[PDB]
Structure 1
Amino acid sequence: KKVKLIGTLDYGKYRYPKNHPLKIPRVSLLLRFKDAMNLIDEKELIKSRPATKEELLLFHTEDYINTLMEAERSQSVPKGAREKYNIGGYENPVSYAMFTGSSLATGSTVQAIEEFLKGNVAFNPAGGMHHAFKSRANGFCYINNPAVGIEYLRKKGFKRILYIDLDAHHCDGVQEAFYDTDQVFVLSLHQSPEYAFPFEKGFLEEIGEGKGKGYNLNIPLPKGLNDNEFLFALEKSLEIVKEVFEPEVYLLQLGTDPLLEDYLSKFNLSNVAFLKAFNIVREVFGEGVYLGGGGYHPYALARAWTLIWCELSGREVPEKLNNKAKELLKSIDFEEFDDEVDRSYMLETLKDPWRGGEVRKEVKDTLEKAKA
């Protein structure tokens, strides 16, 4: 049983435009980081491969895929593509990330899956692009690696696939994709749609359609969410799943945006709570395929995913970051959103302190209605 990390420094060449949250290095940055912390070896890394047209078609429609391919190389927005495919906008602009990086991130999810099925443990930090629809770009996403991955498994015969999304936002793409089926159970904790993207979906009431009614569970959570609240809903919502679904396999997306320092989230979570959310899912359902997801703060991103890597890699977490790592992080131009909050403290340790607190009624009500 090997523990593999799927990645490449090439993502770093497929960034989104300056004015875009995804303009920064992310997975390429994770690799440089753990290499600087000496927490990864060559024999544990798997080079990302591009998803084949066929694999993408296990979910996405040809016209939508050909539109992506055409738009990228001509580096343009084709006539009627903006409207029909939600491509070209600020949200999902034209770039080399729209198809080449997306395909790369997607092939890595299948790679991650192939590995798991070989009896190994893999983590694909570039995957977890859960917003894309069958024929539409959405929320920075063009290709839905999770859906594509899940369909991959269905073709391999699995009939009870589980998907847990701990990313701060609802995986509306993953939801629409298996909303009418009961072979795939979709579960998601995220910022309530009442105040956060997607805004149009993610509400507790969305429990399915047809045979799938009861196989989609959304856990809308309040702003200022603290560690205890987060963990509370996880353990609690996982329970609802176990009494209703016996998984043959499950995927977990681990976006680091729920963390306190990430601006695209109103949650004030910590690394440790994040790490624990992870281990709790593993305690309940065993090992599964681990995916990446949203994350916009270079420091949180790096420290957080490094914890996941250590946990998997069975290696102790250095309590501090050596100089090579501190310098790396400081070399990235990110520009803090809130002028000066000062996040240099993140450079003084890998595991930050707990940010627990009481558990608001809201959360307990949310869970209770989800239970009922």
Structure 2
Amino acid sequence: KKVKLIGTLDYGKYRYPKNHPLKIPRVSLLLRFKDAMNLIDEKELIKSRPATKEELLLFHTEDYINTLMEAERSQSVPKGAREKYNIGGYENPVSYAMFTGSSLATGSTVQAIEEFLKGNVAFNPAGGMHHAFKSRANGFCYINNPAVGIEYLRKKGFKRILYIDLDAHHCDGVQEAFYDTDQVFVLSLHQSPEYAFPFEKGFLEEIGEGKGKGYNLNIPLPKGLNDNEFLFALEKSLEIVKEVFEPEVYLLQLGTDPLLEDYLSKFNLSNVAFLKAFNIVREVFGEGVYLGGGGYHPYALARAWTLIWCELSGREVPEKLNNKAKELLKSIDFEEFDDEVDRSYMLETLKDPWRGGEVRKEVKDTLEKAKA
């Protein structure tokens, strides 16, 4: 069961516009970072390929896909496309990520799945774009690779697919995609929609409809979440899934935005808790298909996914970043959202300190209701 990483430096050419949270290097950063740390060999790396039109059509509509392609080639928003397809605004702007980048990230998810079928284990850090809908862009996402991947699997004959989303935001796009089917179970932990995007969905009451009733589970969590609360929520919810769904295969979305240093979440988690969560899922369900996800702090993202890669790769996590890695991170076009924060430790060591505390009562009550 070989361990592979799907990616390419090319993503460095498909950044989001100047002020967009996603204009920072991410997967290409991950690759250069690991290389600087000598934590990956060319043999473990699989070059990303674009998704085929056929694969995309497994979930999205022709019209939407064609609009994305036209919008990108003309680098302009086609007539009425802005309101009909939700492209062109500050959220899902025109760029070369809208189709070329997204397609490459989606094709990479299909490759990660192909490796699973071949008996290997793969990680696609560019995937996990969980917000896009069938025919509309949403939350920075143009193409929903998890939805494409899951449909890909169903067509291959799978009837019990599990999707676990650890991203700090609710996977509204994925939830909608399989809300009415019992062949797909969606489990998501995220900041409560009461105070975080998306604000319209992600509540505990949303359990699915029709045959899918009981096959969707949302675990909304409070602000200031600590490592103990996150792992508590994860463990309890996994127990709930285990007792009602026997998955033939599962996908795990690993956005790094739930980390303390990432401003797009009110969660204050550590690297180690993030890794631990990853190992907990594997202890319960074995090996699955691993995807990336939301993450807007370059240092947090690089260190966190490096931990994930070392776990899978079976290699020891070096205590500190070597000088080559420090210069890499320092050379990035970042800038902390908050002037006085002090994140210097991130350029020193890979693993951050544990960030625990007690498990709040509301968190326990939420999991309690969930079990019902």
User: Scaled by the length of structure 1, what TM-score is found?
Assistant: 1.00
- C-alpha offsets along residues 226-273 of structure 1, whole Å, 9 cap, x if unaligned? 000000000000011000000000000000000000000110000000
**Structure 1 moving runs of 4+ over 3 Å:** none
Secondary structure in 2 aligned to 1:220?
Answer: strand
Partner Cα separation in structure 1 for residue 87 and residue 213 of structure 2: 31
Aligned to 2:14: 14
Query: 2 CA distance for matches of 1:37 and 1:167?
Result: 26
Deviation of 1:302 after TM superposition, in Å, equals: 0.1
The whole-number CA distance in structure 2 between the counterparts of 1:46 and 1:9 is: 12
How far has the Cα of 1:62 moved from its partner?
0.5
Report SS of the residue matched to 1:68. Answer: helix
Tell me the SS of whatever aligns to 1:341: coil
Q: CA deviation at 1:342?
A: 1.4
Counterparts of 1:309 and 1:301 in 2: how far apart (Å)?
Answer: 12
The alignment partner of 2:95 has SS state of coil
Aligned to 1:190: 190
Shift of 1:333: 1.8
Q: In structure 1, how many angstroms separate the alpha carbons of the residues matched to 2:360 and 2:136? A: 37
* Aligned mates of 1:94, 1:138 — CA distance in 2: 13
The DSSP-based 3-state class of the residue aligned with 1:29 is: helix
- Separation in structure 2 between the aligned mates of residue 219 and residue 323 of structure 1, nearest angstrom: 41
Structure 1 counterpart SS, 2:217: strand
CA–CA separation in structure 2 for the residues paired with 1:75 and 1:340: 38
1:344 Cα shift? 1.1
Q: How far does residue 216 in structure 1 lie from its aligned partner after superposition?
A: 0.3
Aligned to 2:77: 77
DSSP 3-state at the match of 2:83: helix
Deviation at 1:64, TM superposition (A): 0.4
User: 1:170-214: per-residue Cα shift (whole Å, max 9, x none)?
Assistant: 000000000000100000000100000010000000000100000
Unaligned runs of 5+ in 1: none
- Residue in 2 that maps onto 1:250: 250
Structure 1 residue 151, shift from structure 2 partner: 0.2
> Hey, what's the Cα distance between the residues in 1 that align with 2:226 and 2:58?
38
Q: CA offsets per residue over residues 43-100 of structure 1, 9 Å max, x none?
A: 0000000000000000000000000000000001111111111000100000000000
- Please give the alpha-carbon distance, in whole angstroms, between the structure 2 residues aligned to 1:339 and 1:266: 18
Aligned to 1:283: 283
Q: Find the aligned partners of 2:140 and 2:316 in 1 and give their Cα distance.
A: 34
Q: Using the TM superposition, give the Cα deviation of residue 131 of structure 1 relative to its aligned residue in structure 2, in angstroms.
A: 0.3
**1:134 positional shift:** 0.2
Q: Secondary structure at the match of 1:217?
A: strand
Which deviations, in whole Å up to 9, do the C-alpha atoms of 1:311-333 show, x marking residues without a partner?
A: 00000000100000011001102
1:164 is paired with a residue whose SS is strand
Deviation string 1:23-52 (CA, Å, 9 cap, x unpaired) is 000000000000000000000000000000
Provide the TM-score with structure 2 as the length reference: 1.00
CA distance in 1, matches of 2:204, 2:323: 45
Q: Classify the secondary structure of the residue corresponding to 1:46.
A: strand
- 1:249 & 1:230 partners in 2: Cα distance? 24
Distance in 2, matches of 1:364 and 1:82, equals 42
C-alpha deviation, 1:340, in angstroms? 2.0
Report the identity percentage. Answer: 100
Deviations 1:317-371 (A, max 9, x none): 0010000001100110211001120111111100111001100011001100110
CA distance in 2, matches of 1:266, 1:165: 17
* Distance of 1:117 and 1:299 partners within structure 2: 33
Paired residue secondary structure (2:63): helix
Cα distance in 1 for residues equivalent to 2:139 and 2:249: 27
Question: 2:149 and 2:134 mapped to 1: Cα distance?
Answer: 13
Q: Deviation string for 1:121-146 (max 9, x for gaps)?
A: 10000000000000000000000000
Distance 2:369 2:32 in 1: 44
CA-CA distance at 1:296 after TM superposition: 0.4
Post-superposition CA distance 1:283-314 (Å, at most 9, x none): 00000000000000000000000000000000
Number of equivalences: 372
SS at match of 1:4: strand
1:67 matched residue in structure 2: 67
* Residue number in structure 1 paired with 2:41: 41
2:147 equivalent in structure 1:
147
Give the secondary-structure state (helix, strand or coil) at the position aligned to 1:66: helix
CA distance in structure 2 between the partners assigned to 1:344 and 1:21 by the alignment: 21
In structure 2, distance between residues paired with 1:348 and 1:31: 19
Equivalent positions of 1:128-207 (< 5 A) are 128-207=128-207
Structure 2 distance, partners of 1:321, 1:335, is 20
Aligned partner of residue 261 in structure 2, secondary structure: coil
**CA–CA distance in 1 between the matches of 2:331 and 2:265?**
24
Partner secondary structure for residue 233 of structure 1:
helix
| 1:146-178 C-alpha deviation (Å, 9 max, x unpaired) | 000000000000000000000000000000000
Question: For the residues of structure 1 that align with 2:200 and 2:78, how far apart are their CA atoms?
Answer: 27
Separation in 1 of the partners of 2:239 and 2:182? 17
Distance 1:333 1:49 in 2: 27
Task: Tell me which residue corresponds to 1:332.
Answer: 332
Q: Could you list the runs of 5+ residues in structure 2 that have no partner in the other structure?
A: none
